[PDB]
Amino acid sequence: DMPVERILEAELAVEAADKQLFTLVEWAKRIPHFSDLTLEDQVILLRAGWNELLIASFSHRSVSVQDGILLATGLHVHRSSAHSAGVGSIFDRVLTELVSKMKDMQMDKSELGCLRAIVLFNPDAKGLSNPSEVETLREKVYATLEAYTKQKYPEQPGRFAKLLLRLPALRSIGLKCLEHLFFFKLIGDTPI
Amino acid sequence: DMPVERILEAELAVEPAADKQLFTLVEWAKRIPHFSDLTLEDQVILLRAGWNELLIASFSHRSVSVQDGILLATGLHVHRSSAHSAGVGSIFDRVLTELVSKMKDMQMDKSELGCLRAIVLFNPDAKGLSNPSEVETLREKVYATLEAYTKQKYPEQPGRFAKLLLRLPALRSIGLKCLEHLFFFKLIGDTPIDT
Amino acid sequence: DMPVERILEAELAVEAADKQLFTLVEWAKRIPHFSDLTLEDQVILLRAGWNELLIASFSHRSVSVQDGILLATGLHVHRSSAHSAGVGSIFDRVLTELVSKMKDMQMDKSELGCLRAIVLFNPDAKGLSNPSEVETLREKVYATLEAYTKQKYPEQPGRFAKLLLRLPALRSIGLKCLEHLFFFKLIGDT
Amino acid sequence: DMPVERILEAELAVEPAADKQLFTLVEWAKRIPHFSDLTLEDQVILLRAGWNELLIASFSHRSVSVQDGILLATGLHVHRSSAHSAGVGSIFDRVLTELVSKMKDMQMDKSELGCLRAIVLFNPDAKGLSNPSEVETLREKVYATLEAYTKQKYPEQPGRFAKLLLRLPALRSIGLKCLEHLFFFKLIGDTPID
């Protein structure tokens, strides 16, 4: 009912302004059963999750760089450019709490996809007409990740737990980002 | 040296979905005496620091013209209920009681608004200035000029100069609270449907 | 290394207005190996965690009662008083995201203590001399939680994950609380 | 009706665990002409709304006597180092540059301070006031008195009155930042070999 191969295929498909965010909708639509949720609760789950979903996503892409953040539109963002925009401590957290920990454990794209789908299927999102179906859906994803983890990393019994315990850090960084981060301060547009 | 007449011309010159009017704001700042004579980096520091309070002051005063609600630069008129069911009704009410309501009570004009907006703009406490002295000095010239105007124009109102200056804490207060976004058109058009 | 019985004992041992959350220090000292950490790190971990630890604690205490919150000085606050105080939004997150989920799954004291121990042993806390050690201790607590969960609730194979999935919510509610809630004053200003 | 002496008298009367301490704020407000002439529910409204700015104004001016830290009501001289470790460094810098140094520069006196603090007290935009126009009248008597004192005591300085009032926006905004964290601190001395 929730195959890892479908979730893996959602991650790969998607691999001013504005705008892409369309690429989040295209991602969500390929996650089993998301599309047969009511349209209202889909919007809810996307609006509630977009921020942590983006952070998870660019943090995993930054696993394959140097010492900063590889963002969405092929833009490599560095520590000093962050410490410049006023967002250095947040950027630090992304690097130490997410980027470094994904890199240290060699977290793959199936694992990334499942963690994001758990984030996406959030049964605490307010305005949900049927939280229980969303909850049921989260339950199938983490069952799938637990089986995948036990089948591909049989010598790492703590791995499932280790993945899930990256989610409070993601939530906290998400809240902090909303309160501050994510910029084009390079503006720059001097009209004199 | 810092003539009200030019400050008034600065306001009247700019009188006049990602349209976001940094253009009019810059147009306006360049028309304020002695601003374009500052280090260009310092002019950027001031427009970035004052942007939010300057917009709020603008749309508050143009909202004196109407029965209730807030008029925005696009021609978008927003009422209490459109704010309450958008979760920013508190800050909306504070704009009305603390700013709109008061500008109309005292019947504050464009010369007075311009001078207050110019005081806001010439902010010596703005982080990263190369010469805060050049800015503090220009600020003193605006309120010297504004106090005089108030004696000229409203001789029967001795406290009017102070009354003007005392709207500025509220505006700063409201400016900071609007940094909960207070952008009144929030996406949500979706397809949603495709492949 | 990290016996559940000892974590339970920490929990059982700790069962106008100031001080008194000296029960957090008493509790932390009774968690295996926490006292073998550097004094500076013990302080760091307590300061980074006190907020989540107190919330986890009074949520679990509030599982029995109507639809409110019980504080370990017998102070009992209902939904209506929180909303009147202007903290109704966060109070309702507490009730719906924590209390009502602890009740429904019948989270027990050993599960609570392990969750609080996981929160205590935070390798992401800023200032730590050795994150790695706090990290190993965290790995020990959750291995113990998982085993306990399979031993006592073998019919609920996803109970372990479901417990770990209360932690994002607890972190979120802990931050949201730092925008203020307390014992509840009051304004008897002479 | 609103004499500077009676406002300076208020400042000097209160000059003179845990605590708070801020019993000096209530006793200060009592001695401000006509404050007690208000309904007791408005007196609570004005105080709860003003308290942080009143406190910040107090300790900023008290810090005019020292070299470069903050001097608190008891003796607590706070220096940049113990602030910049309590995670309230940037706010401390703002207190120094926007309030303390400007008060030092212009030699702001205790009658000026008392008047600004009374202006902060009589906030007619305070949520919940039952007679907000009486509060505004009182504020206006405070700023007429302060302008008159200013022209008497500083004939060389014509823009002194405006200068004082132009410190209030910085106090308002530093007040918001403080409410959200400052003033509280800060153990370390809870490490228990107990």
From Swiss-Prot, chain C:
Tissue specificity of this protein: Expressed in aortic endothelial cells (at protein level).
Role, per record: Receptor for retinoic acid. Retinoic acid receptors bind as heterodimers to their target response elements in response to their ligands, all-trans or 9-cis retinoic acid, and regulate gene expression in various biological processes. The RAR/RXR heterodimers bind to the retinoic acid response elements (RARE) composed of tandem 5'-AGGTCA-3' sites known as DR1-DR5. The high affinity ligand for RXRs is 9-cis retinoic acid.
Membership in a protein family: Belongs to the nuclear hormone receptor family. NR2 subfamily.
Key word Transcription regulation present: yes
Species annotation: Homo sapiens
Domain NR LBD: 1-190
UniProt keyword terms in alphabetical order: Acetylation, Cytoplasm, DNA-binding, Metal-binding, Nucleus, Receptor, Transcription, Transcription regulation, Zinc, Zinc-finger
Main location: nucleus
Swiss-Prot/TrEMBL domain comment: Composed of three domains: a modulating N-terminal domain, a DNA-binding domain and a C-terminal ligand-binding domain.
Full protein name: Retinoic acid receptor RXR-gamma
Quaternary data: Homodimer. Heterodimer with a RAR molecule. Binds DNA preferentially as a RAR/RXR heterodimer. Interacts with RARA.
Compartment(s) of residence: Nucleus; Cytoplasm
UniProt GO cellular component terms: chromatin; cytoplasm; nucleoplasm; RNA polymerase II transcription regulator complex
Full protein stretch here: 233 to 446 of 463
Free-text description of this protein's post-translational modifications in UniProt: Acetylated by EP300.
